[PDB]
Amino acid sequence: SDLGKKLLEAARAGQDDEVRILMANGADVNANDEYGSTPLHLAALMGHLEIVEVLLKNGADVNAEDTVGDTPLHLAALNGHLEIVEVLLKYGADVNARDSWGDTPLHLAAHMGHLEIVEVLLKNGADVNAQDKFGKTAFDISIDNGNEDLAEILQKL
Amino acid sequence: KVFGRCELAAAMKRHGLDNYRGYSLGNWVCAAKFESNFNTQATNRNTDGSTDYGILQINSRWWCNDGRTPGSRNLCNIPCSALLSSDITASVNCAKKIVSDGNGMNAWVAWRNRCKGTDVQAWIRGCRL
Instruction: Give a three-class secondary structure readout of B23-85.
Output: ECHHHHHHHHHHHHCCECCCEEECCCCCEEECCCCEECCCCCECCCCCCCCCCCCCEHHHHHC
Q: Where are the alpha helices (DSSP H) in chain A?
A: 2-13, 16-24, 39-45, 49-57, 72-78, 82-90, 105-112, 115-123, 138-144, 148-155
Strands B58-59 and B43-45: unpaired
C-alpha B56/C-alpha B59 separation (Å) is 9
Element (H, E) at B11: helix B5-14
The answer to whether the CB atoms of A80 and B122 lie below 8 A apart is: yes
Overall CATH class of domain B1-129? mainly alpha
Report d(CA A84, CA A114) in Å as an integer: 13
Cα separation, A124 vs A12, in Å, equals 27
Phi-psi region of B22 (alpha: psi -120 to 50; beta: other; left: phi over 0): left
Asked if the Cβ–Cβ distance from A146 to B119 is below 8 Å, we say: no
Query: Is B122's CB within 8 Å of A101's CB?
Result: no
For residue B123, give the chain A residue with the closest CA. Answer: A112
The contacts of residue B79 (CB under 8 Å, 6+ apart) are B64, B65, B66
Domains detected in chain A: 1-157 (1.25.40.20)
In single-letter form, the type of residue at position B51 comes to: T
Report the distance separating Cα B79 and Cα A88, nearest Å.
45
Calpha distance A142→A109 (Å, rounded): 10
- Contact list, B119 vs chain A (CB under 8 Å): 79-80
Across the interface, of A79, A132, A141, the residue whose CB is closest to B119 is A79
3-state secondary structure of B96: helix
Domain boundaries, chain B: 1-129
